[PDB]
Amino acid sequence: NEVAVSYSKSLKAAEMDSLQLPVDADGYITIFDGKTFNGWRGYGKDRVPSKWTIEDGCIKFNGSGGGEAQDGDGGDLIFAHKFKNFELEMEWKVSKGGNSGIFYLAQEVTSKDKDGNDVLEPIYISAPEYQVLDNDNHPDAKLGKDNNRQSASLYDMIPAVPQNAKPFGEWNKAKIMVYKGTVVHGQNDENVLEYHLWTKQWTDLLQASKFSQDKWPLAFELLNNCGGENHEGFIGMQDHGDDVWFRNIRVKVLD
Amino acid sequence: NEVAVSYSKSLKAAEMDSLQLPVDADGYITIFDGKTFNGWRGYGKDRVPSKWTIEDGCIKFNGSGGGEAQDGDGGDLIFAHKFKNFELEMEWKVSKGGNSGIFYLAQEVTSKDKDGNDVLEPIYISAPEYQVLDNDNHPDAKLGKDNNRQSASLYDMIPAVPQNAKPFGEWNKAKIMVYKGTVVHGQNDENVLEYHLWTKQWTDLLQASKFSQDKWPLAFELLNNCGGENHEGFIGMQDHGDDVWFRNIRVKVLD
Ligand SMILES: O=C1[C@@H](O)[C@@H](O)O[C@H](CO)[C@H]1O
Ligand SMILES: O=C1[C@@H](O)[C@@H](O)O[C@H](CO)[C@H]1O
Ligand SMILES: [Ca+2]
Ligand SMILES: [Ca+2]
């Protein structure tokens, strides 16, 4: 009925503690219990930012409208267990004109500035993103190429086809499967895209994106070898300054 | 049909009066009516400078050729309503060898001198600028870095790519969209640059510009927190001493 799941407590720390989490007959582990943030923490932090709350059995982000600014007590949220071959399923609801995202294979990455100080880099320069978006009112829906910044897209690389999202304020179902390099995105019980990590196709997608070797050398390096040496990393959700809700979050380990 | 739009009458005043302005079916408000300067005033002033006139349904600046001097009854012009999330569309036409600009998120800023007197600061140390330029004849087109002073650039920070400006004396279409910190410049119906305010990437752009913390500490402080505490400000156009025409000036409020 339950499985032990290790988790880390702070930036780049080892997974030295474990939670007993429910698992169903098909192997899905419920990683959000509807009541606590146990195992969850802010990306780069040792605590859950206070703009993330629990309401009506959902993880809620309380956004102030600043986009990428991540002002206030915000920042992205991760479940602090590295997964490798997994299938994640969760429900998401976005506010009108809102933007968030579901990250996977994420690494906590710092760089050094010219004086040797640390700089925490964005989660999205190591983590592929399943976009979360109000496709009718957020301008990102019209940017990019072939609708590849609309909901359930692999952000700036592969559009969701079919684009079957429900409108803002409605619950959508997300699926992200990563299995030995094969990745599938699902939206509302349909597979909307499929790709293969660490291939020539993967490099070509990156080189056509905002993360190309020319535009963002660090991002290209991280994403081209997605997941680092061990090809694993965190699932998480995006602070993009907008109200968004997530619930019924469960993960099946596939090997 | 029409919508009430509040405006201020003088330096740093409250927007305690309103105009009834046309709004079309897509939500764009026409803020220049082709006939009057209602709601417009000089930056830092309680009136429209007399070098700004209305000529054949256009706002025209009548330049004497002094560049930054702002001699005579000149100075920059603002529409005195603070916008936060918005899309601006307008047409611009420059004289041969001419220079102007479209400002956004502008603040009316004063500093104090050594004796405690007020000093009105330039609009462009608070306001990002969409450069307006004759790219073939004005020397700005060869200055700066990577063409970041040509038309539709974020002046001294990000070049317009592609550089699709029409020649001098021809009408160009400008788009400025600010949506929860995401900024896009459009020129002649193409998006030519995109950036995100209040991020580490924004700070780095400023720190490489004429507005860096080392070169211009007040400008750095204002622009790094662009739009002030409430992240809003005025749209306006530049007196850079050259004849320039503006028309079809429309703004959609995006939230
Ligand atoms: O939604 C997004 C965009 O609006 C923009 O902020 O870039 C983000 C990171 O690639 C993406 O998550
Ligand atoms: O056009 C311009 C340049 O020629 C120079 O005067 O600086 C101005 C303010 O940054 C800019 O608008
Ligand atoms: Ca997103
Ligand atoms: Ca200018």
Domains of chain B and CATH, by start: 2-253 (2.60.120.560)
Judged by CB atoms closer than 8 Å, whether chains meet at B180 and A66 is answered as yes
What are the angstrom distances between the C-alpha of B207 and each of A71, B196, B204, B214, B217?
Answer: 20, 15, 5, 8, 10
Whether the Cβ atoms of residue A107 and residue B219 lie closer than 8 Å to each other:
no
CB contact under 8 A, A69 and B191: no
Distance CA B48, CA B163 (A): 32
Tokens of A89: 């399923």
Q: Rounded to 5 degrees, what angle do the CA atoms A155, A156, A158 make?
A: 75
Cβ pair B206, B224 in contact under 8 A:
yes
Burial-class residue A185 by CB neighbours within 10 Å (0-12, 13-18, 19+).
Answer: buried
- Asked whether the bond before A139 is cis by omega within 30 degrees of 0, the reply is no
Tokens 């507005």, residue? B211
**Which of A66, A97, A119 has the CB atom closest to B181's CB atom?**
A66
What the block records as the tokens of B26 is 């897509």
- Contact (CB<8Å) A69/B181: yes
Chain A residues closer than 8 Å to B179 by CB: 67, 138-139
Name the closest residue on chain B to residue A140, using Cα atoms. B182
Instruction: Give the method of determination.
Output: X-ray
Secondary structure (DSSP) of chain A: -EEEEEE--STT----EEEEEEB-TT-EEE---SS--TTEEETTSSS--TTEEEETTEEEE---S-GGG--SS---EEEEEEESSEEEEEEEEE-TT-EEEEEEEE---EEE-TTS-EEEPPGGGTS-EEEEE-TTT-GGGGSSSTTTTSTTSBTTTB--SS--PPPTTS-EEEEEEEETTEEEEEETTEEEEEEETTSHHHHHHHHTSTT-TTT-HHHHHHHHTTTTTTT-EEEEE--SSS-EEEEEEEEEE--
Minimum distance, in Å, between the CA of residue B179 and any CA atom of chain A: 8
**Does residue A32 come out as left (phi exceeding 0), alpha (psi in the -120 to 50 range) or beta?**
beta
DSSP letters for chain B? -EEEEEE--STT----EEEEEEB-TT-EEE---SS--TTEEETTSSS--TTEEEETTEEEE---S-GGG--SS---EEEEEEESSEEEEEEEEE-TT-EEEEEEEE---EEE-TTS-EEEPPGGGTS-EEEEE-TTTSGGGGSSSTTTTSTTSBTTTB--SS--PPPTTS-EEEEEEEETTEEEEEETTEEEEEEETTSHHHHHHHHTSTT-TTT-HHHHHHHHTTTTTTT-EEEEE--SSS-EEEEEEEEEE--
User: φ, ψ for residue A123 (rounded to 5)?
Assistant: -60, -30
Distance set, CA A24 to CA A19, B187, B211 (Å): 16, 55, 58
**In this structure, how many other beta carbons lie within 10 angstroms of the beta carbon of residue B117?**
9
A97: nearest CB among B87, B191, B255: B255
Tell me the residue type at B77.
L
Query: Residue A195: is it exposed, middle or buried by C-beta count within 10 angstroms (0-12/13-18/19+)?
Result: middle
Q: Identify all chain B residues contacting A67, using CB atoms and an 8 Å cutoff.
A: 179-182, 196-198
Alpha carbon separation from B177 to A79, B187, B192 (Å, rounded): 35, 12, 12
- Partner residue facing B181 (CB), from A67, A97, A138: A67
Choose among A110, A112, A159: nearest CA to A133: A159
Q: Specify the residue with its C-alpha closest to ligand 1, atom 10.
A: A124
Q: For residues A96 and A248, is the Cβ–Cβ distance under 8 A?
A: no
User: Residue whose CA is closest, atom 9 of ligand 2?
Assistant: B124
- The closest alpha carbon to B156, from B110, B120, B193, B189, belongs to B193
**End-to-end CA distance of chain A, in Å?**
18
Residues of A in contact with B89 (CB under 8 A): none
Give the residue numbers in A contacting B (CB under 8 Å), as ranges.
65-69, 71, 97, 99, 119, 138-140, 143, 240-242
Virtual CA dihedral for A220, A240, B127, B136, nearest 10 degrees?
40
Residue of chain A minimizing CA distance to B227: A66
Taking CB atoms and an 8 Å cutoff, what residues of chain B touch A71?
Answer: 198
Q: Which residue in the block uniquely carries the two structure tokens 């997608």?
A: A205
| Alpha-carbon span A101 to A172, nearest angstrom | 13
Tell how far CA A193 is from the center of its chain: 16
Judge: A139–B182 Cβ closer than 8 Å, yes or no: yes
Q: Which residue has the tokens 């968004």?
A: A244
A77 beta partners:
A42, A237
The strand pair at B233-237 and B77-83 is best described as antiparallel
Give yes or no for a contact between B111 and B36, defined as CB atoms under 8 angstroms apart: no
Residue B73: partners with Cβ closer than 8 Å, 6 or more residues away:
B49, B50, B51
Report yes or no: B21 and B5 within 8 Å, Cβ to Cβ.
yes
Best interface-test mutation with A: which of B182, B201, B202, B225 has the largest number of A CBs within 10 A? Answer: B182
Q: Among all chains, which residue has been given the structure tokens 């830092």?
A: B44
Give the whole-angstrom CA distance, residue A50 versus residue A73: 6
Amino acid at A196: H
Q: Which residues of chain A have a CB within 8 Å of the CB of B194?
A: 143
Rounded to a whole number of angstroms, the CA Rg of chain B reads 17
Nominal resolution (angstroms): 1.7
Return the structure tokens found at B232. Answer: 């809003």
Give the total residue count for chain A. 255
Q: Which atom of ligand 2 is nearest to the CA of B210?
A: 10
Question: Could you tell me which residues come within 8 angstroms of residue A114 by beta carbon, excluding any fewer than 6 positions away?
Answer: none
Q: What does the alpha-carbon distance between residue B187 and residue B132 come to, in Å, rounded to a whole number?
A: 10
| Phi, psi (rounded to 5 degrees) for B136 | -85, -25
